[PDB]
């Protein structure tokens, strides 16, 4: 019935900036301060930053500040670092023992440009007895996120047969890692010779290409 409205759903600020995340409640919380602020990254449980709407949790840095009362609550993150890019939540506790989470807010941190390191992996012979061939292109330690991967099989641009897996933003250098897997069959792999991965990134002046030949390794 009752609502926790977390605004905005996404906010962006560079290193040294500040973000403000507001939670508005339809009904006032239990004893007008029972709200928490949590930080959660990918694959991890959420970590408590604020409990009782102003009190800093143990281990949380002092740059996270919480404020507000009643229905209106605000988390302000000043002095922004590259570690702080995560999804942030608020938790309202109510009468009748009801805990309602907030909608969530993604925080995006603008940091320095890193070029990807490109590696190409031919499929191994144990997959070459199963009738499938997967060629792997790896983009390592790049900032920012936006990069384009193109597959060239005998200089022909592939479409509909490649899939990309991207990691979360890292906790020590805040770069990204990408992989594109090119999936082909037995006969489509052995009818072609040269296999190229072309990577376009804004840290690169030209799209870099790593290639190999089938059987000439």
């Amino acid at each position: 019935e009752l609502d926790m409205t977390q605004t905005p759903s996404s906010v962006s600020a560079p290193v040294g900036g500040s973000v403000t995340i507001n939670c508005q409640s339809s009904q006032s919380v239990y004893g007008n301060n029972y709200l928490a602020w949590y930080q959660q990254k990918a694959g991890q449980p959420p970590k408590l930053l604020i409990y009782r709407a102003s009190t800093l949790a143990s281990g949380a840095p002092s740059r996270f500040k919480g404020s507000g009362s009643g229905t209106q609550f605000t988390l302000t993150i000043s002095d922004l670092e590259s570690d702080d890019a995560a999804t942030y939540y608020c938790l309202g506790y109510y009468n009748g023992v009801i805990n309602v989470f907030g909608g969530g807010t993604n925080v995006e941190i603008k940091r320095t440009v890193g070029a990807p390191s490109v590696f190409i992996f031919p499929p191994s012979d144990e997959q070459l007895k199963s009738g499938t061939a997967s060629v792997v292109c790896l983009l390592n330690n790049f900032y920012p996120r936006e990069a384009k991967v193109q597959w060239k099989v005998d200089n022909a641009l592939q479409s509909g047969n490649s899939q990309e897996s991207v990691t979360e933003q890292d906790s020590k250098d805040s770069t990204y890692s990408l992989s594109s897997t090119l999936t082909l069959s037995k006969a489509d792999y052995e009818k072609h010779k040269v296999y190229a991965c072309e990577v376009t990134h804004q840290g690169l002046s030209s799209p870099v290409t790593k290639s190999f030949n089938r059987g000439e390794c």
Partner: protein, 548 residues
Amino acid sequence: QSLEESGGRLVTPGTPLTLTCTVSGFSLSTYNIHWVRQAPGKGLEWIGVIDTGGGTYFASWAKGRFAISKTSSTTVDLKMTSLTAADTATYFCAKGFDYSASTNLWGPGTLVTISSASTQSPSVFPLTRCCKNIPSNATSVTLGCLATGYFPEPVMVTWDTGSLNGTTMTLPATTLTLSGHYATISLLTVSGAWAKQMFTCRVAHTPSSTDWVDNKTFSVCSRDFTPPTVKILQSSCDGGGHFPPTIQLLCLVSGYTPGTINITWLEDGQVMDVDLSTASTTQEGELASTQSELTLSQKHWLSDRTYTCQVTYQGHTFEDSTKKCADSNPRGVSAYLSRPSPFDLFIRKSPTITCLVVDLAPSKGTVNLTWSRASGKPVNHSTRKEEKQRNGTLTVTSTLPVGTRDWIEGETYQCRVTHPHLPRALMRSTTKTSGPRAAPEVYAFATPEWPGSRDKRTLACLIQNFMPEDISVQWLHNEVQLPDARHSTTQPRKTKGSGFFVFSRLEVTRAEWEQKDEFICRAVHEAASPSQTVQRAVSSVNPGKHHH
């Protein structure tokens, strides 16, 4: 002082599920336990709380489907009923100071999947770069494993680097677009003496089994050699177009870097005895050349059998194929449909049927392959493999799981084959045999000892007077069921009176009978009693007590 969740797995919709939060460090008589879930791509969502006194309080959307119980002093159970696909989530348990879920101590979460696909084990393959593209001065190297084709999430990959240090990066999974299965990579970056270091990835898939562990052990190179080329030449027919009385096959393995090499000839894929052919290796300069000569009768050549030249060189396989030549080669599509084996029905208790469609011409487009039941009741999801063959055709295999009770009560299953280039639909059907029943007689025998067969013996088994014809025979030795390939089994033939018979032949080695000389021939058959199996043991010692 920590918490950990367990019990998350793949179940069907409607299946109840129990998770266990095991705590350590604190007491549950002081602290409450919160339960929070989170779908993939969605935020956090509170489920419930149990207090120290055992009172459980839930959210508004729970509606009595969730129950929390204190089972011991360290474990708290959460039970779910009425599960649909919206409950596919990572579940966290938390140590609550009060009824508010404002806390800093959380568990890592366990993953619950509600779907309707097959549980598939991952296929793990090494990912090494091209060593010609690997520079020689490379102080560090990046390597990996691909764990693909599994369903569902998760797998976990650890790394054995030896004495070296290694940064391990596991990427998130991608759903495969054609199959729906998942695929992960795990990358390991090492430094130092990586060129002689032997690296292992350990991939585990707890939805398959709890102790499903695959170790892929590999070194990091892919430089091999300069590649040989294989070609096969043959005898000419004569000036009248007639075949000679014998046919010579010359398998030529052209110039390669000298090394150990093996040649196997195959007749429709089956290994031939090495005595009927020769092989020769010469070396000129720094380069080797290899030839192999095969002799065949004219009759075998005219019987349209396919012969394969198999080259094994430095742990890599090369191959070439031949059959009797032709001016024109017509062929049409054919289809075969099996019944489940008794072993799968009654021992494994997981019967399947297979529709095998062979000799289609690889035209444009995929072939339509549909399963149906005459009753209109639903079929399970099937699996489909398509494989290009040595003789140039494309063979498509579809395997359908069938219900055990469904099969036993006389259901009829249909395989329907359509394709745009087909004239009409190809239709196959299969069903339990409508004949009566009769139990197998089993007799096992050993051949005697005689010269030239001291450390290798032939064992035999007769299975007879059973009806109907569908039977599975296996051999068991020392509490392991031996592989089917170890023995040979004839096709069922009618007895003179009533029923069928089969023969099985198993060659055994000295180490096996010195390990245990008791060998059991076992038949699985629908008419066998009381549990659809019959078995007999034999000892090959069979001691010569003359006149008792």
